[model samples]
Target: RFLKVKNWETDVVLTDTLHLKSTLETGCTEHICMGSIMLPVRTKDQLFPLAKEFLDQYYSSIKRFGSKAHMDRLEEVNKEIESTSTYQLKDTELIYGAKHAWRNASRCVGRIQWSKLQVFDARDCTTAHGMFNYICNHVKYATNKGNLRSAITIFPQRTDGKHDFRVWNSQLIRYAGYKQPDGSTLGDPANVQFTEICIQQGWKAPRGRFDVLPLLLQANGNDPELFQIPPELVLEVPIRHPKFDWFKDLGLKWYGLPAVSNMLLEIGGLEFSACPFSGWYMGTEIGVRDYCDNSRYNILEEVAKKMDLDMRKTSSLWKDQALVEINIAVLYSFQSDKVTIVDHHSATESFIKHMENEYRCRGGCPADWVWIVPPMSGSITPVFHQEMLNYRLTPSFEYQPDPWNTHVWKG
Candidate 1:
């Protein structure tokens, strides 16, 4: 008898080093911990000049020399981002510059674009591969020699588990002794090659690279599995569930979309006259309306039982998945204020590459490796977080890896 082994599956259960909680959504299983970065701090004065120098060097490169010529105006945009009241504007400028770099580095530059030849095509910095490279390189340059740190972007697995973290630096070159705040200095400890994860095999991780290590859990194997229909998704239908909020039918009277309601219906179970009757119907789940009643239901208890039953029904329930995106109130704490700027800057670089893949690839490869949502107006964070959690508690939701992984990986 022959037993076929699954592609990346193993005979023995791998040790759960990742500490992934099954109850959490957006869990990753059968995944890798891409390395992290470490950085030193700098003053605003120091930060601005470093950003400028990098941009200057980037624009002067052979690729931007021709008609798509970015050489001149780089300074103007640079001033806009840097000249703001807070470093926020400057940080934004770096973000765009990082994006531009992401596009350029992904292409085949073996043949240099000499200004004399004038062969710059519309294709420069257009491919996912090029974008990824540009982002990676730009981040590396920014993080190198200790500069600014901002945000984090990670590519995650589709299951949940605690994975160990490793340190990744943007530049392959190792600097000896970084300058200190006292005008003295401290050494970098050791020098390791770049892209070090691809180099190691056994679990003995290398030392001293990043500020933190985060493991992403994959919710499940299938793409559509990790979605629990967000109650907000069905806001238009009048919830009939005895225990849910059917408050003022705030949907459009004309189209039943939110904020277009004709009139406010009475609070209880909804009224008949003047009832436009358009809101998400309750699908056997408890909600705010349920809590409002004198005999409010123990909503979590009821839902928990259903979650168990549904798990056995399809093996697609939250049981064997990676995460359970919980909808907890997100308080912006003083503790949440990001202090370690160096490594975050490094991670952000890799994240921008993930974004490049999303924008450029469009599934050029057979594998669907790309981001689902793109950043907009900086309002996307809360909305995206809420959506992820909304999917987590839904027992009907199954976990899928690649798309979420792609989305998480890109900024």
Candidate 2:
């Protein structure tokens, strides 16, 4: 994929790695490490700009409140950064920054509810069991019996000489994908590699297509520990189309919450590599992208056949027809199960409103239009007609290394 930015009302595209680095080094960019995708850390040049932004904003707020103590603390933080090049923040700053990071996440269309994020501090956790306990709590709380809530549980930050803590699983809730002998996948195709990793690590994986994968926890350079999520705590919705009776026979299902566990949470220049966060799903993310993507579920042809669409001719628009039905099924299933899910049409409109509100409140909103647009029926959404601006924002969530490949587990 290429990166684009508008300059003088013209789109300037950066395609190659060298071009991406040269143009977007100070912005949201990417790199590769040991054959794995990695997000670039702010270099010395880049970090200072974000630090200045944070300090200026902090100073303004403290001055307005007339809190000498906080102002003094802020000064001390700046001095500490100047001398030691790093410093930890107070609990309040971390919490506040976490919410802002969610809001500042350019790829998220659901940022309108970012302020409602439930932040749980677990920085003091020192054991896999403790991490597992906190994660179970996060899952249970976020699931909320299908009325999912956005939540984040922050673990310790990466510090000098201290072993990093991380959750190995992509999400606290995900289905295991088992490759059959006949070269077909039984579960979520996106998780096949991860499921194999779990099996290699001594976890017994069930043969079911949609079996809930266990949590993989690591703390203070310890060997990763496996813990099964309690079945009762997981809220799953079975997929059934609103107008079709045969849809239920497909045995499609999905977890209520999308709790991402592998991404790093960066706030005020501090990196919490172990933080796990969740938000309710946008229906198209599941139906149009995850389930329909060729590398994942690859169910378009199967679905097209069910609808008796002309699959032989490219002009038949069979894929497009199947895609809409899949999205409808996802929306209907989630609503039927009392789960929180946003359809592409309504979500796009809400995102437009969010951008407008952000413009009024924060002067500007940074967004990636490709992510802002829905996967299916792109032309129908208002977001498709709008030109979006994207830039690097601090206090943001970032992609990080896979735990298994990063460090050896010394069991």
Candidate 3:
């Protein structure tokens, strides 16, 4: 499996009770999982109508909403999650698996950089509709129609808002003491304003690569007595990037629920899942603490320890166990290109960086800032999915297996 950010070293593994065949160790190991067979059972014809109903009721609020509204929605959602309880991929499986794996392999490397890493969740947001939304917003879609890249750019082409200083300076601001009449701080004002604006606009800006919450909540609709999401069209809410919309849209028609779940778990080759119930059961305070601070690998470590003890008690010979389809986390820091600043006040051509293969930097991207990729499982709900294949640069899965680690599994 590949890290969302290269060398960040987080890998996803199956949270379900299962094992990987030790024989499949050398060659690429691929295990496919399916969402509830009940998905089609419930959504069959109801998906389209549900989508219509959701849109009719909520579209105006969402469409009119910008980043701030969504950010608030996210906080509210997180609050609800803190109080509620069920299986949430983010808190349960994804974060735990990533962190656990990191601890195991971290010593091999000097120091790890977790800031650059993002992990995709499975099980929770495992839906076709959710995958489209998470990837669309989180990944760098360099098209104008999806126009998100331009709007959320660390350095917007046009920065007339409070988030920006003079041109070419899109850093965030924080105020140490509140005294200025105009309300400018020495810190990251752009970031603060952007965060505020995002909350109002309904943008749950992710700190990591990819995430999907809508699908996770929707998946728990069976337990709607606890939580219920208004149904909506899975793939059509967001406008697609005109360039690759056809291919992405077609993928929606071609893949079934299983294929969709596999995509969430296996993107960049990480087989993973997350705690779908974190925001629901844990309550905002405890749930987030458990996710960000607690050791989720404790679950696995406890499981492994129990297995070892049980085996010792039962048999005369020691039994070996292998964690299969299940990757633990590993973290590392790799070299990246140096940052170069161009004069934004001057010609647009000055910002462009020409690369080969019909791929050239049309304009300057923000400094040392990479695009986000959300957890796929968190995205399974209709709120995010629907718009598919809408990226400027199609994410070609072009990763190579590591040569050094290919031979070892010592922990």
Candidate 4:
């Protein structure tokens, strides 16, 4: 009864067949919408069941379930845990798990390219210097000189419920944010606290609007250290409009690799706490959210004024026009630079196809509609009309507590 929606523009009613109202759990709640919060991390327990489940998946994926090697590996893994209270994953198993994590990422719109992620196993790293070197390597390899590649470089895993290695920055590449004396921000406001953290850890504050922040690498739960990423390794695309000649005057630019640095990757129950993953950009991520979000760039009104549109009236739809041009600039810039970027139209269409393929293969696809839909225009995207059931799946990328949270502070 609650699932039917009458589309205003289409003037047609649609029912929820994908999510059976009778069976779907209330709002993540049938009563309250818990659609946005991240799913809880599985606590350290026996860990065997989780390991067993993932092993089963791994064996089944290779069409070798119950085979001698698979059976022997499973028995050995369980036995290894019996003695050490934990187990290590084989290299191939680790790689397979990383890809599965990408494929099971509920909020990622780019999951269509999930299986292609290159996993760089740096589990041998025990020092922050090692973490920095591996991260730099990941940044270079994934950048591919503007031809971006999807990749993850996994650092050491958590042992005895403690992180052995961690990356303190939110992403591998991001701009430094500084608070100006005149109640304004100098750079990406999304990173002010992190930039402050970097400064406190001995980074010189670059007051420039587009300064690339350095990596804060942590080892053995120690205070993180700053490691500057060489400028050449990060391929940046200067935003230029395909039509408007004056657009380049704004000096907008974004890094080519969207490398997320601070999320924990969980496979079976083994947690790799310092895995940094990267994928090519989706235009709206830069154009709408990063560029136009009021808390971030807040560039809409400036662009609207530049376009000679009336910003005083929302009815004039100046915001929409500005959004389109900014989005256009993003796509045009990336394409001209030969960097990998996908516009919302093609990305969403491809996602719909991915959903079909997922359903055909696995019977259900976990989707977070708020994320899967394009930020600028929701209803115009194909996914906006679809009834998606958002659920958590294993082998996932998870938000972990920030490293600074546990640091001992003294006045």
CA lDDT of every candidate? 0.23, 0.79, 0.21, 0.83
In candidate 3 the C-alpha lDDT for residue 348 amounts to 18
Which residue segments of model 1 deviate by more than 4 Å? 1-44, 53-71, 74-300, 304-411
TM-score of each candidate structure, all chains considered together: 0.20, 0.86, 0.17, 0.91
> lDDT value for candidate 2?
0.79
Candidate number of the best lDDT: 4
Q: State candidate 3's TM-score.
A: 0.17
Clashes, model 1: 56
Better of 1 and 2 by lDDT: 2
Over 17-95, each residue of candidate 1 has an lDDT whose tens digit, in order, gives 1112112333223584211211101234544444445444445443453334454444554564356411222333333
Give the C-alpha miss distance for residue 155 in model 4, angstroms: 1.0
lDDT string, candidate 3, 1-411, tens digits:
211111112221112111120111212125632221212112213223322222232323236333565345434434443454111222322343343232222111100221122444333333334433433332322221222111111111111111110110011111111113675432222234333333333545343211112221112111100111122211111112222322223111100000011111111112222111100010111111211222221122332353353444435322222121011110000001111111111111211111110122111111111111111122322212211111111111112222122213122
The sequence of per-residue lDDT tens digits that candidate 4 reaches over residues 32-76 is 677775442243365888898899989999999999999899899
Deviation from native of the Cα of residue 188 in model 4, angstroms: 0.6
Supply the TM-score for candidate 1. Answer: 0.20
Clashes of 4: 3
RMSD of each: 26.3, 5.9, 28.2, 3.8
The alpha-carbon lDDT assigned to residue 32 of candidate 4 equals 66
Sorted on lDDT, highest at the top, how do the candidates line up?
A: 4, 2, 1, 3
